[PDB]
Amino acid sequence: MGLFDRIKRVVSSNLNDLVNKAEDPEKMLEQAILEMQEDLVQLRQGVAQAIAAQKRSEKQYNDAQNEINKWQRNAQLALQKGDENLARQALERKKTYTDTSAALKASLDTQSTQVETLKRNLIQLESKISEAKTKKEMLKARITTAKAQEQLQGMVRGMNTSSAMSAFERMEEKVLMQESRAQALGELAGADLETQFAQLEGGSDVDDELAALKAQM
Amino acid sequence: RSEKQYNDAQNEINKWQRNAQLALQKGDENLARQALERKKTYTDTSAALKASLDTQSTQVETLKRNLIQLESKISEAKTKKEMLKARITTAKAQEQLQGMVRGMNTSSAM
Numbered sequence: 001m002g003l004f005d006r007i008k009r010v011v012s013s014n015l016n017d018l019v020n021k022a023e024d025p026e027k028m029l030e031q032a033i034l035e036m037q038e039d040l041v042q043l044r045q046g047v048a049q050a051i052a053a054q055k056r057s058e059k060q061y062n063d064a065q066n067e068i069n070k071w072q073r074n075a076q077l078a079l080q081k082g083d084e085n086l087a088r089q090a091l092e093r094k095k096t097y098t099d100t101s102a103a104l105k106a107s108l109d110t111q112s113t114q115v116e117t118l119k120r121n122l123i124q125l126e127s128k129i130s131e132a133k134t135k136k137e138m139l140k141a142r143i144t145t146a147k148a149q150e151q152l153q154g155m156v157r158g159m160n161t162s163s164a165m166s167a168f169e170r171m172e173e174k175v176l177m178q179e180s181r182a183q184a185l186g187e188l189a190g191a192d193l194e195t196q197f198a199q200l201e202g203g204s205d206v207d208d209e210l211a212a213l214k215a216q217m
Numbered sequence: 218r219s220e221k222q223y224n225d226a227q228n229e230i231n232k233w234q235r236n237a238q239l240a241l242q243k244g245d246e247n248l249a250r251q252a253l254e255r256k257k258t259y260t261d262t263s264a265a266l267k268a269s270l271d272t273q274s275t276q277v278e279t280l281k282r283n284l285i286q287l288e289s290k291i292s293e294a295k296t297k298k299e300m301l302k303a304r305i306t307t308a309k310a311q312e313q314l315q316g317m318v319r320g321m322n323t324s325s326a327m
Contacts, residue, residue, distance in 0.1 A: 123258060127265065134219060134269055138276070145280055152283060155290045168294065175301050179308040182315065189318045 026143055029136045036132065040125055047118045054111045061108055064101035068094055219270050226263035230256055 075090035154162020157169065186192065237252035316324020 127262060130262075131265070131269065134266075134273075137218070138273060141280075142276075145283075149283065152287050152290070155287075165294075172297065172301060175305055175308075179304055179311075182308045182311045185312070185315045185321075185323075189315065189320060191318065 026140060029139060033129070033133055033136055036129055040129060043122060043125060047115075047122050050115050050118050054108070054115050057104070057108050057111055061101060061104050064097055064104060068097045068101060071097060219266070219273055223263060223266050223270055226259055226266060230259045230263060233259060 071090050071094040075087045075094065078086035078090055151162060151164065153159075154165050160166040160169075233252050233256040237249045237256065240248035240252055313324060313326065315321075316327050
């Protein structure tokens with residue numbers, strides 16, 4: 001058991017590197033965004049359920065409030081045309097209705113309080129997804145730039161990592177060597193001393209003539 | 218695209234402030250409260266988005282500079298190519314100078 005663990009760790013490292021070779025940032029950076037949005041959808045549906053529950057609760061509040069006044073008006077009618085007992089019954093019912101309405105509003109308040117937090121959380125979700133979507137577009141351009149920035153960095157005369165400039169440097173070297181050979185075929189001939197001696201006298205003639213002509217003028 | 222989104226958010230912030238104006242004129246306090254609450258979130262979003270637009274511009278600056286350097290290097294290489302072509306065509310016959318000396322027989326013409 002102290003050896004099978006090691007074997008399985010080695011196998012797992014093999015497989016994990018075999019996979020991490022396949023991952024490609026350009027497509028993964030978009031699949032991640034896709035899944036994030038797909039989950040935001042379900043969160044939205046949950047918030048929708050919560051708000052619907054709140055709406056139903058407030059509708060019940062409204063119905064109870066309406067019936068309270070309905071029974072008060074019917075007590076009015078009873079007292080007008082009926083007797084004291086009928087008004088007593090109507091008022092007794094209206095009391096229970098008012099109690100129910102107050103008790104229900106007491107909870108409607110907290111329901112609204114909770115819905116507020118839910119909506120705020122959803123807003124934060126949307127902001128985070130937007131930021132991630134911006135970063136995706138930034139990094140895609142970074143990728144497409146770095147994929148060829150090597151073709152700047154190979155421009156230096158030293159490194160041969162860019163065959164495009166390597167086959168240029170080698171050709172330049174070959175041409176320079178060819179010209180050097182053709183020229184040195186002269187110093188082999190022995191004309192270098194003759195050229196040096198001739199130029200030791202001919203070099204300053206132009207300057208001397210210019211100076212003399214300036215003096216004359 | 219990022220800066221366009223910034224502009225849209227900035228526009229809608231003022232739109233909601235104006236609608237709060239209208240609510241306070243004709244409506245009630247709760248409507249203005251709702252409008253201001255929405256405008257707060259819009260302003261927060263706009264500021265957060267500009268915070269990243271800044272760095273995006275910073276990166277684009279470096280990218281453009283690198284491209285400029287690329288173009289300069291290619292121009293220099295293109296100049297060297299034309300220099301070395303003439304060097305080649307000269308050295309291909311400079312042997313017909315160097316054979317002119319009385320000693321070497323490498324030039325059958327002389």
